[PDB]
Structure formats: C-alpha cells, structure tokens
Known about the structure:
By secondary structure, the chain is of the alpha/beta class. The protein has helices spanning 12-24, 36-47, 63-77, 99-121, 138-145, 148-155, 161-177, 189-211, 240-243, 245-251; strands at 3-6, 28-33, 54-57, 80-85, 125-134, 218-223, 264-266, 269-271.
Amino acid sequence: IHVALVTGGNKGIGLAIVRDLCRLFSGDVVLTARDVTRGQAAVQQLQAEGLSPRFHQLDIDDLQSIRALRDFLRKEYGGLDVLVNNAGIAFKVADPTPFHIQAEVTMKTNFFGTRDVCTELLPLIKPQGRVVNVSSIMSVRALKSCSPELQQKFRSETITEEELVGLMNKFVEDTKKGVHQKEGWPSSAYGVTKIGVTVLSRIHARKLSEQRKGDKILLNACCPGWVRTDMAGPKATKSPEEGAETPVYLALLPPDAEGPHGQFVSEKRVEQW
Ligand SMILES: NC(=O)c1ccc[n+]([C@@H]2O[C@H](COP(=O)([O-])OP(=O)(O)OC[C@H]3O[C@@H](n4cnc5c(N)ncnc54)[C@H](OP(=O)(O)O)[C@@H]3O)[C@@H](O)[C@H]2O)c1
Ligand SMILES: O=C(O)CNC(=O)[C@@H]1CSCN2CN1C(=O)CC[C@H]2C(=O)O
Ligand SMILES: [Cl-]
C-alpha cells in the first residue's frame, strides 16, 4: 500500500493538501498534527466530506515524536512514498516581539524542525517517491536583501547541509548580539528560515541524485502564494484549496518524470534561485 503524509495537516494549507491527496493519491494519506485533538477534528472534517485520511501525531520540534512516526511508517508501510513538509510558523505583520526572539522561535521550527523530519524520513522514501518542502516567496525578498557574500553562499551549488546549519545558527546568534545588519543579514527572520528551507531542499535533491541515482525520486521546494489561513489573514489572495495546488502538483509528479528536481517552484513553474 502506497502512503503519503503531510506535516501541519490540521488546518491551513496542510489540511487542503491532505484533502487533495485523499481525492487523488493512489494509496493511504496520513494527516499529521502536533495536537492530537486538532488532528482528529480535522480527520472528522474530511470524513464529513466523504474522505478517509489516516492520522498520526507529529510535533516536528520533538525528535522523539519524529522517530515514533518513522518507526510507524517502517512497521505499517515499509517506508514512505510522498512527504509534504508543510508545518511552519511566523509572527504577525508588525508584531512587536523583539527581532532576536522572532529569529530564535521561527528558526527552531521552520528550519531545524523541518530538517529533523528530513533527516529521519528521507531514508524511508521509496523509488518514484516525491518530497515537497513548503517554503515562501518571502525567501526571495530575504535573499535579495542579503550582502553579496551571503547571496553567493546561499546560491552555491556545492554548499553542504553542515555549512547551511552554520549559516542558520549564525543568523540567530547575530540577531542576539545586535550585529545582524553589519553581518549582511536581511531583516525578516521568517524569510531567513525560508532561505534555509529552500537551500536545504537544493542540498537534499543533490544528495538524492548522487546517492540514489535510478530511484526516480523528485524533491522540490515550493511557494504556495499568499493564502487565507491563520498565518496570514482574510485579505490574502488565495483560498487554502488554491494554496495547495503547487504542493499537490509536486507531490503527484508522474512516475519516471525527470523533473522538476531540486527546484524552487511557484504556480507550478520553476523560479531561478
Ligand atoms: N500566505 C500564507 O499562508 C503562506 C505563504 C507562503 C508560505 N506559507 C507556508 O505554508 C505552510 C503552511 O502555513 P499556513 O498558512 O497553512 O499556516 P497555519 O494555518 O498557521 O498552519 C500551520 C500548520 O503548521 C503546524 N505547525 C506549526 N508548528 C508545528 C510543529 N512544531 N509541529 C507540527 N506542526 C506544526 C500548525 O499546527 P497547530 O494548529 O498545532 O499550530 C498548523 O497545522 C507554512 O510552512 C508557511 O510558512 C504560508
Ligand atoms: O510586512 C512585513 O514586513 C511583515 N509581515 C510578514 O511578512 C507576514 C508574516 S506571516 C509569514 N509570511 C509573510 N507575511 C504574510 O503576511 C504573508 C504570509 C507569509 C508568507 O508569505 O510566507
Ligand atoms: Cl509564497
């Protein structure tokens, strides 16, 4: 039995991705959520629409929670076909929380939590599997505002995961020390975490090509657009159903497709990083 899984599945874009996968994906779809009550309520919402998602708890900030999910997927399915890393957090527009606190809080979940899910679950991905990391067009605004030296580092085709980890930790520590402008950083803390998600996706796509050549796995970062969810607000352009389109596209690329792979994709089109 084939299996697809979405992180941060109880609301927002992640719930919409789950719904579309329940309609389209040939196999089981696992809705995950950090809070069991909110995950179960979202499964009941989808069951009221005629769909049958499975549920498993997952808090991407708890490595034990990630490992419990890893063990469940190995036991029940022998691995994983589709992984959508959707979970993320942000501060509201004009939120008065100090910039160094926004940096530490956003970085912990959006970069290091997503990275731990990839560390634990990438080895489970089966041939013809797809992995989708939900990034944001805020990563482009952040990248363009970096110093030219940071832009070169973040665009490099040879950067390692450990080098990227050093940069993400350096951003957080530079905000605490009050030196992030002199050190070449932009001034959106969420946007730097999404630079991290985009570059992590590039590194992981290169690793899959080098080490799993022939297994036909495709891994991409994506931008869902501005979507009416609790992260954003009712002015946002897209419904959750519309925001889900590009992630669903990337999750369901036909077997044997040669790409996109390692791309940063918006409205189903590759953007130059
Ligand atoms: N305009 C937009 O909405 C927009 C634009 C570009 C990119 N994005 C990206 O789209 C993705 C979905 O965001 P959204 O707009 O749908 O936001 P949302 O409505 O706030 O949903 C975020 C989801 O992530 C979950 N989450 C947060 N921290 C988690 C953790 N530690 N472990 C597991 N799940 C966690 C939330 O769970 P709880 O219910 O427990 O909080 C919720 O299920 C995020 O990566 C976001 O950066 C959004
Ligand atoms: O206007 C600003 O500089 C501050 N606010 C934001 O960028 C705002 C925080 S929520 C995270 N993202 C960017 N913001 C949004 O409202 C759009 C949703 C989200 C995104 O585009 O990724
Ligand atoms: Cl976006």
